[PDB]
Amino acid sequence: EHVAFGSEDIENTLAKMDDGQLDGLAFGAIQLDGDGNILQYNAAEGDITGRDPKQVIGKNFFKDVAPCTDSPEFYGKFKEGVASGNLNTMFEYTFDYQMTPTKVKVHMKKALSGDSYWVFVKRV
Ligand SMILES: *C(=O)/C=C/c1ccc(O)cc1
Numbered sequence: 001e002h003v004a005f006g007s008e009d010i011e012n013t014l015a016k017m018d019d020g021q022l023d024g025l026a027f028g029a030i031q032l033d034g035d036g037n038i039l040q041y042n043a044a045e046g047d048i049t050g051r052d053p054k055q056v057i058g059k060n061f062f063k064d065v066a067p068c069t070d071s072p073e074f075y076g077k078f079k080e081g082v083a084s085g086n087l088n089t090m091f092e093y094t095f096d097y098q099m100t101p102t103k104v105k106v107h108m109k110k111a112l113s114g115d116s117y118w119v120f121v122k123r124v
Helices: 010-014 043-049 061-065 072-084
Strands: 028-032 038-041 088-095 102-110 117-123
Touching: 010 102, 010 117, 028 043, 043 102, 043 117, 072 088, 072 102, 072 117
Parallel strands: none
Antiparallel strands: 028 038, 028 117, 088 102, 102 117
């Protein structure tokens, strides 16, 4: 798939993409429910972070997979967006739990489908 990171209509392009389609993207893509449980997780994300995209589905991103994100700067933004029903924020961050610290750019954006939120990730 040819979709740019940060593209304005990304939620429309990715909407209802199956797991296989998402694996064609040139950046990491995670879909979370409103509680932070992982619904989808693509190959590019697993290459960035080391996690196995097959095993993380169903785990809680903030409580277990990615505790380094449970701060106001990441999780706090996420839950504000869930509470309001509108989320569109892009910021750099470092992923450092049980891994070499890895600097990324994160884009969180509400998905079109119900109770769904995208977390997009690229290397910086
Ligand atoms: C901090 O604990 C970050 C961890 C992490 C970020 C993103 C992922 O896809 C997996 C783990």
